Symmetry: C2
Subunit: 250 residues, 2 copies
Protein backbone atom coordinates (compact mmCIF):
# COMPACT_ATOMS: atom_id res chain seq x y z
CA UNK A 1 0.00 0.00 0.00
CA UNK A 2 1.03 3.60 -0.13
CA UNK A 3 2.32 3.81 3.42
CA UNK A 4 4.71 0.92 2.84
CA UNK A 5 5.86 2.59 -0.44
CA UNK A 6 6.28 5.84 1.52
CA UNK A 7 8.30 4.05 4.24
CA UNK A 8 10.56 2.43 1.59
CA UNK A 9 11.13 5.82 -0.09
CA UNK A 10 11.98 7.53 3.21
CA UNK A 11 14.40 4.70 4.17
CA UNK A 12 16.38 5.20 0.97
CA UNK A 13 17.52 8.67 2.01
CA UNK A 14 20.85 7.68 3.52
CA UNK A 15 23.73 10.15 3.88
CA UNK A 16 26.72 8.52 2.15
CA UNK A 17 24.61 5.88 0.37
CA UNK A 18 22.39 8.20 -1.65
CA UNK A 19 19.19 7.54 -3.41
CA UNK A 20 19.67 8.17 -7.13
CA UNK A 21 16.54 9.20 -9.05
CA UNK A 22 15.84 9.57 -12.75
CA UNK A 23 12.89 11.69 -13.73
CA UNK A 24 10.22 9.93 -15.82
CA UNK A 25 7.44 11.69 -17.73
CA UNK A 26 4.88 9.01 -18.75
CA UNK A 27 3.97 5.44 -18.06
CA UNK A 28 6.26 4.01 -20.78
CA UNK A 29 9.32 5.82 -19.40
CA UNK A 30 8.34 4.77 -15.87
CA UNK A 31 8.23 1.12 -16.89
CA UNK A 32 11.60 1.36 -18.68
CA UNK A 33 13.28 2.98 -15.68
CA UNK A 34 11.77 0.42 -13.23
CA UNK A 35 12.85 -2.46 -15.50
CA UNK A 36 16.38 -1.05 -15.59
CA UNK A 37 16.60 -1.52 -11.79
CA UNK A 38 15.53 1.74 -10.23
CA UNK A 39 14.45 1.61 -6.61
CA UNK A 40 12.05 4.53 -6.84
CA UNK A 41 10.74 6.93 -9.52
CA UNK A 42 10.49 10.70 -9.67
CA UNK A 43 8.66 12.96 -12.02
CA UNK A 44 10.33 16.10 -13.21
CA UNK A 45 8.24 19.12 -14.06
CA UNK A 46 10.42 20.18 -16.99
CA UNK A 47 10.34 16.71 -18.62
CA UNK A 48 6.59 16.28 -18.12
CA UNK A 49 5.90 19.73 -19.56
CA UNK A 50 8.16 19.15 -22.56
CA UNK A 51 6.64 15.73 -23.29
CA UNK A 52 3.17 17.32 -23.23
CA UNK A 53 4.09 20.35 -25.37
CA UNK A 54 4.23 23.01 -22.58
CA UNK A 55 6.97 25.39 -21.31
CA UNK A 56 3.34 25.66 -13.80
CA UNK A 57 2.01 26.46 -17.24
CA UNK A 58 0.70 22.86 -17.49
CA UNK A 59 -2.62 22.73 -15.63
CA UNK A 60 -2.44 20.92 -12.30
CA UNK A 61 -5.17 18.44 -13.32
CA UNK A 62 -3.22 17.40 -16.40
CA UNK A 63 -0.06 16.90 -14.20
CA UNK A 64 -2.15 14.79 -11.84
CA UNK A 65 -3.45 12.68 -14.71
CA UNK A 66 0.12 12.09 -15.87
CA UNK A 67 1.11 11.23 -12.30
CA UNK A 68 -1.67 8.65 -11.94
CA UNK A 69 -0.59 6.89 -15.16
CA UNK A 70 2.99 6.84 -13.89
CA UNK A 71 1.95 5.54 -10.48
CA UNK A 72 -0.08 2.69 -11.85
CA UNK A 73 2.65 1.59 -14.31
CA UNK A 74 4.95 0.16 -11.66
CA UNK A 75 5.06 -1.04 -8.05
CA UNK A 76 7.83 1.43 -7.14
CA UNK A 77 7.40 4.40 -4.84
CA UNK A 78 6.82 7.56 -6.90
CA UNK A 79 7.66 11.14 -5.89
CA UNK A 80 6.24 14.09 -7.78
CA UNK A 81 7.72 17.46 -8.68
CA UNK A 82 5.04 19.99 -7.70
CA UNK A 83 7.19 23.04 -8.52
CA UNK A 84 6.07 25.92 -6.19
CA UNK A 85 2.93 23.95 -5.26
CA UNK A 86 0.27 25.15 -7.77
CA UNK A 87 -1.33 27.48 -5.25
CA UNK A 88 -1.51 31.18 -4.39
CA UNK A 89 -1.86 30.75 -0.62
CA UNK A 90 -0.75 27.94 1.79
CA UNK A 91 -4.23 26.44 1.83
CA UNK A 92 -3.97 26.13 -1.99
CA UNK A 93 -0.64 24.33 -1.76
CA UNK A 94 -2.24 21.98 0.83
CA UNK A 95 -4.92 21.07 -1.74
CA UNK A 96 -2.20 20.35 -4.31
CA UNK A 97 -0.35 18.02 -1.93
CA UNK A 98 -3.60 16.33 -0.97
CA UNK A 99 -4.33 15.77 -4.64
CA UNK A 100 -0.84 14.29 -5.18
CA UNK A 101 -1.57 11.79 -2.41
CA UNK A 102 -4.96 10.92 -3.97
CA UNK A 103 -3.04 10.38 -7.27
CA UNK A 104 -0.78 7.89 -5.41
CA UNK A 105 2.45 9.83 -4.95
CA UNK A 106 4.36 9.21 -1.69
CA UNK A 107 6.37 12.42 -1.73
CA UNK A 108 7.05 15.65 -3.55
CA UNK A 109 9.47 18.37 -4.41
CA UNK A 110 8.15 21.78 -3.29
CA UNK A 111 10.14 24.82 -4.35
CA UNK A 112 10.56 28.22 -2.67
CA UNK A 113 10.46 30.49 -5.72
CA UNK A 114 7.69 32.55 -7.29
CA UNK A 115 6.64 31.30 -10.67
CA UNK A 116 5.86 35.02 -11.58
CA UNK A 117 9.41 36.45 -11.20
CA UNK A 118 11.65 33.43 -10.39
CA UNK A 119 12.64 35.29 -7.24
CA UNK A 120 12.77 33.64 -3.83
CA UNK A 121 9.82 33.77 -1.49
CA UNK A 122 10.47 35.20 2.02
CA UNK A 123 11.74 32.36 4.26
CA UNK A 124 8.60 32.31 6.39
CA UNK A 125 6.21 32.56 3.41
CA UNK A 126 8.01 29.55 1.92
CA UNK A 127 7.89 27.74 5.27
CA UNK A 128 4.18 28.38 5.59
CA UNK A 129 3.57 26.57 2.26
CA UNK A 130 5.68 23.62 3.57
CA UNK A 131 3.68 23.59 6.79
CA UNK A 132 0.36 23.51 4.93
CA UNK A 133 1.71 20.61 2.83
CA UNK A 134 2.81 18.69 5.99
CA UNK A 135 -0.58 19.23 7.52
CA UNK A 136 -2.33 17.94 4.41
CA UNK A 137 -0.15 14.82 4.39
CA UNK A 138 -0.62 14.29 8.15
CA UNK A 139 -4.42 14.58 7.77
CA UNK A 140 -4.30 11.93 5.02
CA UNK A 141 -2.55 9.58 7.51
CA UNK A 142 0.16 8.84 4.99
CA UNK A 143 3.98 8.42 5.19
CA UNK A 144 4.87 11.20 2.72
CA UNK A 145 8.24 12.77 1.99
CA UNK A 146 8.34 16.56 1.45
CA UNK A 147 11.61 17.39 -0.27
CA UNK A 148 11.91 21.20 0.13
CA UNK A 149 13.75 22.70 -2.81
CA UNK A 150 15.54 25.97 -2.23
CA UNK A 151 16.67 28.07 -5.16
CA UNK A 152 19.35 30.10 -3.31
CA UNK A 153 22.19 28.60 -5.35
CA UNK A 154 20.12 27.79 -8.42
CA UNK A 155 19.35 31.49 -9.12
CA UNK A 156 22.98 32.66 -8.42
CA UNK A 157 25.95 32.58 -10.84
CA UNK A 158 28.46 29.96 -9.88
CA UNK A 159 31.20 32.48 -9.29
CA UNK A 160 29.14 33.95 -6.45
CA UNK A 161 28.63 30.68 -4.58
CA UNK A 162 30.23 31.17 -1.25
CA UNK A 163 29.71 30.90 2.50
CA UNK A 164 27.13 33.75 2.57
CA UNK A 165 24.92 31.80 0.14
CA UNK A 166 25.54 28.59 2.08
CA UNK A 167 24.50 30.38 5.27
CA UNK A 168 21.30 31.64 3.61
CA UNK A 169 20.64 28.11 2.37
CA UNK A 170 21.09 26.69 5.90
CA UNK A 171 18.79 29.36 7.45
CA UNK A 172 16.11 28.31 4.93
CA UNK A 173 16.79 24.65 5.66
CA UNK A 174 16.25 25.19 9.39
CA UNK A 175 12.97 27.05 8.81
CA UNK A 176 11.79 24.43 6.33
CA UNK A 177 12.66 21.55 8.66
CA UNK A 178 10.80 23.23 11.50
CA UNK A 179 7.75 23.62 9.22
CA UNK A 180 7.82 19.88 8.48
CA UNK A 181 10.05 19.25 5.46
CA UNK A 182 11.71 15.83 5.30
CA UNK A 183 14.53 16.60 2.87
CA UNK A 184 16.40 19.58 1.43
CA UNK A 185 17.11 19.89 -2.29
CA UNK A 186 19.78 22.49 -3.30
CA UNK A 187 20.09 22.53 -7.11
CA UNK A 188 22.81 24.54 -8.70
CA UNK A 189 25.33 23.61 -6.08
CA UNK A 190 28.50 21.80 -7.35
CA UNK A 191 31.32 22.95 -4.97
CA UNK A 192 32.72 20.09 -2.94
CA UNK A 193 33.63 22.31 0.00
CA UNK A 194 30.21 23.91 0.08
CA UNK A 195 28.41 20.54 -0.32
CA UNK A 196 30.48 19.16 2.60
CA UNK A 197 29.59 22.14 4.75
CA UNK A 198 25.95 21.74 3.82
CA UNK A 199 25.70 18.07 4.65
CA UNK A 200 27.60 18.67 7.98
CA UNK A 201 25.13 21.39 9.08
CA UNK A 202 21.82 20.50 7.41
CA UNK A 203 18.97 19.53 9.61
CA UNK A 204 17.66 17.31 6.78
CA UNK A 205 18.96 14.72 4.30
CA UNK A 206 20.57 16.57 1.44
CA UNK A 207 19.69 16.22 -2.27
CA UNK A 208 22.01 17.68 -4.85
CA UNK A 209 21.70 17.64 -8.67
CA UNK A 210 24.36 15.99 -10.85
CA UNK A 211 24.91 17.93 -14.09
CA UNK A 212 28.49 17.79 -15.27
CA UNK A 213 30.72 14.77 -15.14
CA UNK A 214 31.92 16.33 -11.82
CA UNK A 215 31.44 15.78 -8.98
CA UNK A 216 30.68 12.12 -9.62
CA UNK A 217 28.14 9.98 -7.77
CA UNK A 218 30.88 8.40 -5.67
CA UNK A 219 32.26 11.85 -4.78
CA UNK A 220 28.84 13.19 -3.82
CA UNK A 221 28.25 10.11 -1.63
CA UNK A 222 31.58 10.69 0.11
CA UNK A 223 30.56 14.32 0.84
CA UNK A 224 27.58 12.92 2.78
CA UNK A 225 24.74 13.53 0.28
CA UNK A 226 21.59 11.46 0.78
CA UNK A 227 19.85 11.89 -2.57
CA UNK A 228 20.99 12.61 -6.15
CA UNK A 229 18.85 14.18 -8.93
CA UNK A 230 19.51 14.60 -12.64
CA UNK A 231 16.78 17.04 -13.75
CA UNK A 232 15.69 16.60 -17.35
CA UNK A 233 18.87 14.75 -18.43
CA UNK A 234 17.13 11.38 -18.99
CA UNK A 235 14.43 12.94 -21.21
CA UNK A 236 17.01 14.98 -23.12
CA UNK A 237 19.19 11.95 -23.79
CA UNK A 238 16.18 9.94 -25.07
CA UNK A 239 15.29 12.86 -27.34
CA UNK A 240 18.91 13.18 -28.61
CA UNK A 241 18.70 9.59 -29.78
CA UNK A 242 15.41 10.39 -31.53
CA UNK A 243 16.76 13.53 -33.26
CA UNK A 244 19.88 11.65 -34.43
CA UNK A 245 17.77 8.85 -36.00
CA UNK A 246 15.89 11.54 -37.99
CA UNK A 247 19.07 13.22 -39.22
CA UNK A 248 20.94 10.00 -39.98
CA UNK A 249 18.02 8.63 -42.02
CA UNK A 250 17.94 5.79 -39.45
CA UNK B 1 -2.17 23.56 -47.21
CA UNK B 2 -0.97 20.80 -44.78
CA UNK B 3 -2.92 18.08 -46.55
CA UNK B 4 -1.86 19.15 -50.05
CA UNK B 5 1.76 19.38 -48.85
CA UNK B 6 1.56 15.85 -47.37
CA UNK B 7 -0.03 14.42 -50.52
CA UNK B 8 2.62 16.01 -52.73
CA UNK B 9 5.39 14.31 -50.69
CA UNK B 10 4.33 10.85 -51.86
CA UNK B 11 6.77 10.68 -54.76
CA UNK B 12 7.78 7.31 -56.13
CA UNK B 13 11.59 7.26 -56.14
CA UNK B 14 11.78 10.37 -53.94
CA UNK B 15 9.91 8.97 -50.98
CA UNK B 16 8.63 10.57 -47.80
CA UNK B 17 10.42 9.13 -44.80
CA UNK B 18 8.24 9.14 -41.65
CA UNK B 19 9.14 8.67 -38.07
CA UNK B 20 6.35 7.69 -35.71
CA UNK B 21 6.01 10.13 -32.82
CA UNK B 22 3.96 9.56 -29.70
CA UNK B 23 3.62 12.83 -27.87
CA UNK B 24 3.97 16.57 -28.36
CA UNK B 25 7.60 16.50 -27.15
CA UNK B 26 8.68 13.79 -29.66
CA UNK B 27 6.75 15.63 -32.35
CA UNK B 28 8.74 18.81 -31.68
CA UNK B 29 12.07 16.90 -31.59
CA UNK B 30 11.40 15.25 -34.95
CA UNK B 31 10.25 18.50 -36.48
CA UNK B 32 13.32 20.35 -35.21
CA UNK B 33 15.51 17.57 -36.65
CA UNK B 34 14.33 18.51 -40.21
CA UNK B 35 11.33 16.23 -40.84
CA UNK B 36 8.84 17.43 -43.47
CA UNK B 37 5.81 15.63 -42.00
CA UNK B 38 4.96 13.59 -38.92
CA UNK B 39 3.16 10.34 -38.29
CA UNK B 40 1.67 9.01 -35.13
CA UNK B 41 2.13 5.33 -34.51
CA UNK B 42 -0.43 3.35 -32.53
CA UNK B 43 2.02 0.99 -30.84
CA UNK B 44 4.31 3.84 -29.66
CA UNK B 45 1.38 5.89 -28.36
CA UNK B 46 -0.03 2.88 -26.50
CA UNK B 47 3.41 2.02 -25.06
CA UNK B 48 4.15 5.56 -23.91
CA UNK B 49 0.75 5.62 -22.20
CA UNK B 50 1.10 2.26 -20.41
CA UNK B 51 -0.84 -0.11 -22.69
CA UNK B 52 -6.32 1.75 -26.10
CA UNK B 53 -9.57 3.79 -26.31
CA UNK B 54 -10.34 6.04 -29.30
CA UNK B 55 -10.71 9.09 -27.03
CA UNK B 56 -7.15 8.80 -25.63
CA UNK B 57 -5.68 8.50 -29.08
CA UNK B 58 -7.65 11.60 -30.18
CA UNK B 59 -6.50 13.53 -27.14
CA UNK B 60 -2.89 12.54 -27.80
CA UNK B 61 -3.38 13.26 -31.48
CA UNK B 62 -4.65 16.79 -30.91
CA UNK B 63 -1.71 17.60 -28.67
CA UNK B 64 0.73 16.28 -31.33
CA UNK B 65 -0.99 18.30 -34.06
CA UNK B 66 -0.80 21.55 -32.10
CA UNK B 67 2.87 20.98 -31.28
CA UNK B 68 4.17 21.84 -34.72
CA UNK B 69 3.17 23.34 -38.08
CA UNK B 70 4.00 20.11 -39.92
CA UNK B 71 1.39 17.95 -41.55
CA UNK B 72 0.41 15.08 -39.27
CA UNK B 73 -0.96 11.71 -40.27
CA UNK B 74 -2.51 9.36 -37.71
CA UNK B 75 -2.45 5.59 -37.40
CA UNK B 76 -6.10 4.61 -36.81
CA UNK B 77 -5.45 0.84 -36.87
CA UNK B 78 -8.69 -0.81 -38.19
CA UNK B 79 -10.63 2.43 -37.78
CA UNK B 80 -12.03 2.10 -34.21
CA UNK B 81 -15.48 1.24 -35.52
CA UNK B 82 -17.73 -1.79 -35.84
CA UNK B 83 -19.37 -0.74 -39.14
CA UNK B 84 -18.40 1.66 -41.92
CA UNK B 85 -20.51 4.40 -40.24
CA UNK B 86 -18.36 4.09 -37.13
CA UNK B 87 -15.13 4.32 -39.17
CA UNK B 88 -16.49 7.52 -40.72
CA UNK B 89 -16.94 8.95 -37.21
CA UNK B 90 -13.33 8.05 -36.28
CA UNK B 91 -12.12 9.86 -39.40
CA UNK B 92 -14.24 12.88 -38.54
CA UNK B 93 -12.75 12.98 -35.04
CA UNK B 94 -9.24 12.84 -36.48
CA UNK B 95 -10.03 15.77 -38.77
CA UNK B 96 -11.44 17.75 -35.81
CA UNK B 97 -8.14 16.89 -34.08
CA UNK B 98 -6.23 18.42 -37.05
CA UNK B 99 -4.82 15.28 -38.73
CA UNK B 100 -4.55 15.47 -42.53
CA UNK B 101 -4.31 11.75 -43.19
CA UNK B 102 -4.44 8.29 -41.70
CA UNK B 103 -3.43 4.70 -41.88
CA UNK B 104 -6.51 2.45 -42.03
CA UNK B 105 -6.01 -1.35 -41.85
CA UNK B 106 -8.08 -4.13 -43.45
CA UNK B 107 -7.92 -6.66 -40.62
CA UNK B 108 -10.24 -7.45 -37.69
CA UNK B 109 -8.50 -5.90 -34.68
CA UNK B 110 -9.20 -8.64 -32.10
CA UNK B 111 -8.13 -11.54 -34.43
CA UNK B 112 -5.76 -10.21 -37.11
CA UNK B 113 -7.85 -11.89 -39.86
CA UNK B 114 -8.42 -10.02 -43.14
CA UNK B 115 -11.83 -8.69 -43.91
CA UNK B 116 -13.24 -9.78 -47.26
CA UNK B 117 -12.23 -7.29 -49.96
CA UNK B 118 -15.64 -5.70 -50.33
CA UNK B 119 -16.01 -5.09 -46.53
CA UNK B 120 -12.48 -3.60 -46.28
CA UNK B 121 -13.22 -1.40 -49.30
CA UNK B 122 -16.55 -0.26 -47.77
CA UNK B 123 -14.71 1.00 -44.71
CA UNK B 124 -12.25 2.92 -46.89
CA UNK B 125 -15.21 4.37 -48.81
CA UNK B 126 -16.83 5.51 -45.56
CA UNK B 127 -13.56 7.13 -44.52
CA UNK B 128 -13.16 8.88 -47.88
CA UNK B 129 -16.75 10.14 -47.74
CA UNK B 130 -16.30 11.38 -44.18
CA UNK B 131 -13.22 13.37 -45.34
CA UNK B 132 -14.99 14.62 -48.48
CA UNK B 133 -18.02 15.65 -46.35
CA UNK B 134 -15.65 17.64 -44.12
CA UNK B 135 -14.15 19.46 -47.12
CA UNK B 136 -10.50 18.56 -46.37
CA UNK B 137 -7.54 17.29 -48.42
CA UNK B 138 -7.03 14.07 -46.39
CA UNK B 139 -4.67 11.23 -47.29
CA UNK B 140 -5.98 7.74 -46.69
CA UNK B 141 -3.10 5.29 -46.56
CA UNK B 142 -4.76 1.93 -46.92
CA UNK B 143 -2.87 -0.72 -44.98
CA UNK B 144 -3.32 -4.26 -46.15
CA UNK B 145 -2.22 -7.10 -43.95
CA UNK B 146 -1.82 -9.72 -46.71
CA UNK B 147 1.93 -10.04 -46.14
CA UNK B 148 1.65 -9.12 -42.47
CA UNK B 149 -0.76 -11.99 -41.65
CA UNK B 150 0.37 -14.68 -44.13
CA UNK B 151 3.17 -17.20 -43.59
CA UNK B 152 6.49 -16.10 -45.12
CA UNK B 153 6.53 -19.18 -47.37
CA UNK B 154 3.31 -18.10 -49.09
CA UNK B 155 4.97 -14.65 -49.87
CA UNK B 156 4.96 -15.06 -53.64
CA UNK B 157 3.48 -13.77 -56.87
CA UNK B 158 0.13 -15.13 -55.58
CA UNK B 159 0.29 -13.08 -52.39
CA UNK B 160 1.35 -10.09 -54.54
CA UNK B 161 -1.55 -10.86 -56.82
CA UNK B 162 -3.88 -10.74 -53.80
CA UNK B 163 -2.27 -7.53 -52.55
CA UNK B 164 -2.71 -5.90 -55.96
CA UNK B 165 -6.34 -6.93 -56.40
CA UNK B 166 -7.07 -5.45 -52.92
CA UNK B 167 -5.13 -2.31 -53.80
CA UNK B 168 -7.23 -1.77 -56.86
CA UNK B 169 -10.50 -2.24 -54.90
CA UNK B 170 -9.13 0.12 -52.29
CA UNK B 171 -8.11 2.75 -54.83
CA UNK B 172 -11.65 2.55 -56.35
CA UNK B 173 -13.04 3.07 -52.83
CA UNK B 174 -11.04 6.31 -52.30
CA UNK B 175 -7.66 5.24 -50.94
CA UNK B 176 -4.72 7.49 -51.66
CA UNK B 177 -1.78 5.22 -50.70
CA UNK B 178 -1.05 1.54 -50.17
CA UNK B 179 0.90 0.26 -47.12
CA UNK B 180 2.14 -3.30 -47.22
CA UNK B 181 3.82 -4.15 -43.93
CA UNK B 182 5.67 -7.44 -43.79
CA UNK B 183 6.95 -7.03 -47.35
CA UNK B 184 10.68 -7.25 -47.41
CA UNK B 185 11.69 -9.07 -50.62
CA UNK B 186 13.38 -6.63 -53.02
CA UNK B 187 11.96 -8.52 -56.07
CA UNK B 188 8.41 -8.34 -54.70
CA UNK B 189 8.70 -4.69 -53.64
CA UNK B 190 9.86 -3.84 -57.19
CA UNK B 191 7.04 -5.86 -58.70
CA UNK B 192 4.56 -4.15 -56.36
CA UNK B 193 5.61 -0.61 -57.07
CA UNK B 194 5.62 -1.13 -60.81
CA UNK B 195 2.02 -2.44 -60.80
CA UNK B 196 0.45 -0.61 -57.88
CA UNK B 197 -2.49 1.74 -58.56
CA UNK B 198 -1.31 3.86 -55.60
CA UNK B 199 1.91 5.27 -54.10
CA UNK B 200 3.53 2.49 -52.06
CA UNK B 201 4.59 2.63 -48.38
CA UNK B 202 7.01 0.00 -47.11
CA UNK B 203 8.18 -0.35 -43.49
CA UNK B 204 11.90 -0.61 -42.73
CA UNK B 205 12.82 -3.52 -40.51
CA UNK B 206 16.62 -3.22 -40.23
CA UNK B 207 18.83 -0.14 -40.89
CA UNK B 208 19.75 -1.91 -44.14
CA UNK B 209 18.59 -1.16 -46.81
CA UNK B 210 19.21 2.56 -46.81
CA UNK B 211 16.54 5.13 -47.59
CA UNK B 212 18.39 5.49 -50.92
CA UNK B 213 18.13 1.79 -51.83
CA UNK B 214 14.41 1.66 -51.01
CA UNK B 215 13.86 4.75 -53.15
CA UNK B 216 15.51 2.97 -56.05
CA UNK B 217 12.81 0.22 -55.74
CA UNK B 218 10.20 2.85 -56.62
CA UNK B 219 8.55 3.23 -53.22
CA UNK B 220 6.86 6.52 -52.36
CA UNK B 221 6.78 6.39 -48.55
CA UNK B 222 8.99 4.74 -45.93
CA UNK B 223 7.94 4.20 -42.34
CA UNK B 224 9.70 2.62 -39.37
CA UNK B 225 6.95 1.34 -36.94
CA UNK B 226 7.94 1.77 -33.27
CA UNK B 227 11.64 1.72 -33.91
CA UNK B 228 12.18 5.40 -33.02
CA UNK B 229 10.36 5.02 -29.64
CA UNK B 230 12.24 1.79 -28.93
CA UNK B 231 15.60 3.44 -29.60
CA UNK B 232 14.76 6.36 -27.30
CA UNK B 233 13.76 3.89 -24.56
CA UNK B 234 17.00 1.93 -25.11
CA UNK B 235 18.96 5.07 -24.35
CA UNK B 236 16.86 5.72 -21.25
CA UNK B 237 17.39 2.18 -19.95
CA UNK B 238 21.15 2.39 -20.59
CA UNK B 239 21.37 5.67 -18.64
CA UNK B 240 19.72 4.19 -15.63
CA UNK B 241 22.00 1.10 -15.72
CA UNK B 242 25.13 3.31 -15.94
CA UNK B 243 23.89 5.32 -12.94
CL1 LIG C 1 12.79 17.16 -15.41
CL1 LIG D 1 28.73 25.63 -6.69
CL1 LIG E 1 15.56 16.91 -10.46
CL1 LIG F 1 4.46 2.87 -33.65
CL1 LIG G 1 8.44 -10.87 -48.39
CL1 LIG H 1 4.89 2.28 -39.79
Amino acid sequence: GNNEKGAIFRSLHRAGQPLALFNVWDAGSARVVADAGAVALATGSWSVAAANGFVEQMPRALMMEVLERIVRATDLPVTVDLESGYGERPEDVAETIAMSIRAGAIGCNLEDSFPSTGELRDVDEAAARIAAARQAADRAGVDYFINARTDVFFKAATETHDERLLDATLARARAYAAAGADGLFVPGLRSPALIRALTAASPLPVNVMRVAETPTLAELAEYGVARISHGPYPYLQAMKTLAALVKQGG
